Amino acid sequence: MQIFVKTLTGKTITLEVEPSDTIENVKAKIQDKEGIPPDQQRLIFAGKQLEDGRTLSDYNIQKESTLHLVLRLRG
């Protein structure tokens, strides 16, 4: 199924998942599509931090649940 991960930059990211892919699995593919590994970002859904360890099924991340992703932006 598709979900989306809108970020600090708006460049919404289209990524097909499964109901029990993990948070570092999703972070494994945003490093396979923009090149930034599973320690450098932090996923946020419904005001709640996605723990590296868990999996979609735990949070009701159904089809297309807008997800969000915090980078480390230096200014």
Partner: protein, 239 residues
């Protein structure tokens, strides 16, 4: 250089200031508040507060910060009176997508560059909008940018009934020098001085010596990240 330069740590400061001064709202690091979406999201945010004043359970969901929950964003909206916005300017740039693609990987290059944090503080209790820049004139001239915020100020006066908002230049004396990457730290320091006293003048709070000024700021940065070192999560504060 200084660890008050990352968007995440500037958010932790905004939370630290809501813990010490409860009238201030924390910042949202999730929409790009560069010069393009600069005054649109201020009008947007201050409106969804005045829509918060009447009973509202719908507009809070859409104009919510992503890191916050919309019930908590409504409670923090209804009780806050000071609203800071950190804006990211680059003088080499003039389109949102390129200023953004520039960021999209300026985060994965991760070097900083010619960046520069700016601060506007919108305070509905004074009906005042202060602008601060560590380098004063580096993002626009001091009396065009002032128009821009005298332009925002009258729009704000229209959705917040008592007359337009007041404008104060925060930055009068140049306080940064060359090759210093401490503009988030000066934005933080101005916000702390502001929240303690909104009618302070920064020229008496800054030493006229330059090296004494840098030593003060590095003492502030150390005190600040000591106060912040236990802020882990990024979510908006509960209390």
């Amino acid at each position: 250089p200084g660890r008050l330069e990352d968007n995440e740590h500037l958010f932790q400061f905004s939370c630290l200031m809501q813990n010490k001064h409860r009238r201030v709202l924390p910042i949202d690091i999730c929409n790009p508040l560069t010069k393009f979406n600069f005054l649109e999201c201020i009008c947007n945010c201050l409106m969804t507060k005045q829509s918060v004043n009447v009973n509202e359970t719908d507009m809070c969901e859409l104009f919510c910060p992503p890191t916050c929950t919309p019930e908590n964003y409504r409670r923090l909206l209804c009780t806050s009176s000071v609203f800071p916005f950190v804006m990211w300017h680059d003088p080499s740039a003039d389109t949102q997508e390129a200023m953004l693609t520039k960021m999209d990987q300026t985060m994965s290059s991760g070097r900083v560059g010619n960046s520069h944090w700016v601060l506007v503080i919108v305070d509905i209790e004074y009906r005042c909008v202060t602008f601060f820049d560590s380098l004063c004139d580096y993002v626009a001239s001091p009396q065009q940018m002032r128009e821009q915020l005298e332009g925002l100020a009258v729009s704000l006066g229209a959705i917040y009934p008592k007359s337009p908002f007041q404008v104060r230049i925060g930055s009068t004396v140049k306080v940064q020098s060359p090759g210093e990457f401490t503009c988030g730290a000066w934005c933080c320091q101005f916000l702390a001085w502001y929240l303690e006293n909104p009618d302070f003048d920064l020229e008496e709070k800054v030493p006229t010596n330059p090296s004494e000024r840098r030593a003060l700021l590095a003492d502030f940065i150390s005190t600040t990240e000591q106060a912040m070192s236990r802020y882990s999560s990024l979510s908006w504060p509960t209390t």
